[PDB]
Amino acid sequence: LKKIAESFEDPSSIVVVLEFILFALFFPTEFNRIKGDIQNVLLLFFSRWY
Amino acid sequence: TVTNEFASRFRTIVATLANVVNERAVQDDMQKATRSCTKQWLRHLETQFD
Structure with missing residues (x-):
């Protein structure tokens, strides 16, 4: 994954989540090839929000 | 660790103060x-702390 610096302060940070989701739909294969590196971002999102 | 325990502690502290300031602000009709x-x-x- 090309690196994403995201702290997830604001709800607007949901954009990044959506980015991933879109990428998951348009490109399930490539998404699957990088999905752990994505989970590193989602874990920031989740620890911060949930 | 994926997550810094000190920083997570500051998150809980700020969560607590957040609901504290909130309770005060709703008490004072902010x-x-x-x-x-x-x-x-x-x-x-x-x-910043993280």
């Missing part, structure tokens, strides 16, 4: 805008 701004400030402190 405008939603100022409330949102203190909350934003706290989230910023969490990021």
